[PDB]
Amino acid sequence: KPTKVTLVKSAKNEEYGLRLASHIFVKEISQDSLAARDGNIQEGDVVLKINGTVTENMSLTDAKTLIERSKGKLKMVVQRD
Amino acid sequence: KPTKVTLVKSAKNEEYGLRLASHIFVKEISQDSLAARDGNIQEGDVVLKINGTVTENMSLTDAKTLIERSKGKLKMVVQR
C-alpha cells in the first residue's frame, strides 16, 4: 500500500536530501510475439542496456530513438526484478 | 545474473511484442537530511506521484521541472 510524503524546506538553499533515478522495465510481453517465443525476457524485468547503451536515467523518448537506431535488430540486457 | 537478449525482426513493420515503462525510484537518501527526518520514505521506494502528478513514464528532467514549480514544498506518493 502507497505512502504520502510531505517535505517542507526551512531555507531557500536547503536540499531535500533525495537522489532520484529512473529505470525502464518490461511492462508487458505480447502473446506469441518475437519476445515471447524467444523466452529470455520476462514481465517485470528491468532493462539495464539497449544496444550497448545503459538505460538508467534515460527517458522513454530517448530509449525510443535508441531502439529505432538499429532497424530489424534489438539487443538488450535485462535483469529479473 | 543479468541476461543478454537479441531480437531480430523479419520486417520493419513487425513488432517485437514489448511494452516498456519507466519508474522513478529513491536511489539514496542523504544522512540526517530533511527527507530522512521528516519522512516515511526509504531507499528503493518507487515514486508513484509528485505534487499529484503520476510519475510513471516521466523523465527525470520533467520531474525536476515539476518539483521546482512548488518551491519549498514537496508532496510525494511512494511504494515499497
Binding site: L18, L20, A21 | L60
Partner: peptide, 9 residues
Amino acid sequence: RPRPDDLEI
C-alpha cells in the same frame, strides 16, 4: 551507483 544524470534535490 552515483550517476551524473541522477536527480539530486
